[PDB]
């Protein structure tokens, strides 16, 4: 499932902003 | 109604920002609510009133080193000047030899992020309840010529009535016209930001599209392990919807997650009203939401003032304040 794919991925935790 | 008077109040504070309205020893520091690239946000207790607050602490040297001076001054200048039911309130600000400090009302319900990941996904009425508050908030911000530029669940806090308080004005900017900075959070970046196109407030409406999708699906519309992989998916714009999305929700999302700037809802001649009058929002009483008269779908558990149970734990570090003033000139106006 797409949800299972998301939960196994590297970016399910809090996401930092990017800049500059 | 509110908008006419609100612009005049905003502009007065914009032109003459408040400055130096507290100092560090007036607060007991309790624990860290979140960490970021330039510092952290701590739960604190104001000694005189006993009230609890969230104090964002920024390292001046690091801000200067990474060339984020203007964004930081934007953040504080704008947050002290705005006033809206769904924006966090800045109560005090000050600086010392080493740091900048922005003391906000404490929003004890935690990040929408936490609740969303725990529950999995929000039902469409639940998501729509939050989405309506963001729509109104952007209507307010954009009317003041502000662009927000970092909508995501991590920056959305749930208050004691279950309503949203938007925090993190790190990238907020007052701009009439287009702007070019590569900033935001990868999952939420509009295509025109990724392509170095120059862009306008339409990027906030794209981000609302991403937010509503993530709220309703439980995962964002473009995800991968690396930001560059995400960026490829965004500029291609081939969004696919969970089968449980309503027809109305898919139609709204197709119009918000619209790669062509000049066709994107929020950015057409009719502005925000194209979104407000969209069929997905047919049951939304915009005035009742604004007046906070709608009962929220979810009310966080609170164990008292200073309760942090709705936040993750972070490792604590001492606040270090050098005996020498750092970067004084750079932050004169803070
Ligand atoms: N007023 C507040 N009340 C309670 N918690 C808050 C408040 N403001 C911020 N937080 C918490 O602190 C975290 C970090 O704050 P903020 O998002 O402003 O930091 P940041 O360094 O700009 O992060 P980002 O990487 O998103 O740019 C938030 O995600 C939220 O958990
Ligand atoms: Mg943030
Ligand atoms: Mg930020």
Q: Domain spans of chain B?
A: 1-16+111-301, 17-110+302-332
Contact present, A17 and B171 (Cβ < 8 Å): yes
Alpha-carbon distance values, A11 to B74, B127, B194, B329 (Å): 29, 21, 19, 38
Distance between CA atoms of residues B209 and B212, nearest Å: 5
Q: Is A15's CB within 8 Å of B120's CB? A: no
Distance between CA atoms of residues B122 and B212, nearest Å: 10
Taking CA atoms, what residue in A is nearest to B34?
A14
Interface contact A8, partner B, CB < 8 A: no
What single string gives the DSSP state of each residue in B290-303? HTT-SPPS------
Distance between CA atoms of residues B66 and B125, nearest Å: 42
Task: Tell me the sheet residues that pair with B101.
Answer: B57, B94
Q: Is B109 annotated as a binding residue?
A: yes
CA atoms within 13 A on the CB side of B49: 10
**Nearest protein Cα to ligand 1, atom 4:** B107
DSSP tag of B272: T
**Residue B185, min C-alpha distance to chain A (Å):** 4
Q: Which CATH number fits domain B17-110+302-332: 3.30.420.40, 3.10.620.30, 3.30.200.20, 2.60.40.1120?
A: 3.30.200.20
For residue B255, give the H/E element and its range.
helix B247-256
Contact present, B242 and B172 (Cβ < 8 Å): no
Of the candidates B310, B299, B320, the one whose C-alpha atom is nearest the C-alpha of residue B126 is: B299
Contact present, B173 and A2 (Cβ < 8 Å): no
The 3-state DSSP class for residue B73 equals: helix
To test the contact with chain B by mutation, choose from A7, A15, A20 the residue with the greatest count of B C-beta atoms within 10 A, namely A15
Taking CA atoms, what residue in B is nearest to A7?
B219
Q: Return left, alpha or beta for B177; rule: phi > 0 is left, psi -120 to 50 is alpha, else beta.
A: left
B282 CA from centroid of ligand 1 (Å): 32
Indicate which residue of B150, B159, B168, B274 is catalytic: B150
Task: Collect all residues of chain B within an 8 Å Cβ-Cβ radius of residue A14.
Answer: 34, 111, 113, 154, 312
For residue B127, give the H/E element and its range.
helix B124-143
Distance between CA atoms of residues B215 and B249, nearest Å: 12
Distance between CA atoms of residues B266 and B200, nearest Å: 11
Contact present, B282 and B5 (Cβ < 8 Å): no
A7 CA from centroid of ligand 1 (Å): 23
Distance between CA atoms of residues B286 and B135, nearest Å: 10
- Taking the domain B1-16+111-301, which CATH number applies? 1.10.510.10
Distance between CA atoms of residues A19 and B291, nearest Å: 35
Distance between CA atoms of residues B68 and B17, nearest Å: 19
φ, ψ for residue B131, nearest 5 deg: -55, -40
- Method for this entry: X-ray
Largest CA distance in chain A: 36
| Whether residue B307 lies in the annotated active site | no
Q: Exposed/middle/buried for B20, CB within 10 Å: 0-12, 13-18, 19+?
A: exposed
The 3-state DSSP class for residue B313 equals: coil
- The answer to whether domain B1-16+111-301 and domain B17-110+302-332 are alike in fold is no
Structure token pair of residue B62: 């690091």
Distance between CA atoms of residues B128 and B154, nearest Å: 18
Q: Which residues make Cβ contacts (< 8 Å) with residue B212, sequence separation at least 6?
A: B127, B131, B249, B252, B253, B256
Q: Which residues make Cβ contacts (< 8 Å) with residue B246, sequence separation at least 6?
A: B124, B280
Angle at B207 between CA B33 and CA B211, to 5 degrees: 65
Of the candidates B191, B193, B151, the one whose C-alpha atom is nearest the C-alpha of residue B171 is: B151
Angle at B313 between CA B97 and CA B171, to 5 degrees: 55
Q: Is B171's CB within 8 Å of A17's CB? A: yes
Contact present, B209 and B256 (Cβ < 8 Å): yes
Taking CA atoms, what residue in A is nearest to B311?
A14
Of the candidates B304, B185, B50, the one whose C-alpha atom is nearest the C-alpha of residue A18 is: B185
Of A3, A9, A19, nearest to B218 by CB-CB distance is: A3
Task: Collect all residues of chain B within an 8 Å Cβ-Cβ radius of residue A4.
Answer: none
Of the candidates B102, B65, B13, the one whose C-alpha atom is nearest the C-alpha of residue B330 is: B65
Interface contact A9, partner B, CB < 8 A: yes
For residue B5, give the H/E element and its range.
helix B2-15
Of the candidates B199, B122, B211, the one whose C-alpha atom is nearest the C-alpha of residue B166 is: B211
B289 CA from centroid of ligand 1 (Å): 24
Alpha-carbon distance values, B272 to B47, B139, B256, B266 (Å): 43, 7, 11, 5
């Amino acid at each position: 499932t797409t949800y299972a794919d998301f939960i196994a991925s590297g970016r399910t935790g809090r996401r930092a902003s990017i800049h500059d | 109604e509110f908008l006419a008077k609100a612009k005049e109040d905003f502009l007065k504070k914009w032109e003459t920002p408040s400055q130096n309205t507290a100092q560090l020893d007036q607060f007991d520091r309790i624990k860290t609510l979140g960490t970021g690239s330039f510092g952290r946000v701590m739960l604190v207790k104001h000694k005189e009133s006993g009230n609890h607050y969230a104090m964002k602490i920024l390292d001046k040297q690091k801000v200067v080193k990474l060339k984020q001076i203007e964004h930081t001054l934007n953040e504080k200048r704008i947050l002290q000047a705005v006033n809206f039911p769904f924006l966090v309130k800045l109560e005090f600000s000050f600086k010392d030899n080493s740091n900048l400090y922005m003391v906000m009302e404490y929003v004890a319900g935690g990040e929408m992020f936490s609740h969303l990941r725990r529950i999995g996904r929000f039902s469409e009425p639940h998501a729509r309840f939050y989405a309506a508050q963001i729509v109104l908030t952007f209507e307010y911000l954009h009317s003041l010529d502000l662009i927000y530029r970092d909508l995501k669940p991590e920056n959305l806090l749930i208050d004691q009535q279950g309503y949203i308080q938007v925090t993190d004005f790190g990238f907020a900017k007052r701009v009439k016209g287009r702007t070019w900075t590569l900033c935001g959070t990868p999952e939420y970046l509009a295509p025109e930001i990724i392509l170095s196109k120059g862009y306008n407030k339409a990027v906030d409406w794209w981000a609302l599209g991403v937010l509503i999708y993530e709220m309703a699906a439980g995962y964002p519309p473009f995800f991968a392990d690396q930001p560059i992989q995400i960026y490829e998916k965004i500029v291609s714009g081939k969004v696919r919807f969970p089968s449980h999305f309503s027809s109305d929700l898919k139609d709204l999302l197709r119009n918000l997650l619209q790669v062509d700037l000049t066709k994107r809802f929020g950015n057409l001649k009719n502005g925000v009203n194209d979104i407000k009058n969209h069929k997905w929002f047919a049951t939304t009483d915009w005035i009742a939401i604004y007046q906070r008269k709608v009962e929220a779908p979810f009310i966080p558990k609170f164990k008292g003032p200073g309760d942090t149970s709705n936040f993750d734990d972070y490792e604590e570090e001492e606040i270090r304040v050098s005996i020498n003033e750092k970067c004084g000139k750079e932050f004169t106006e803070f």
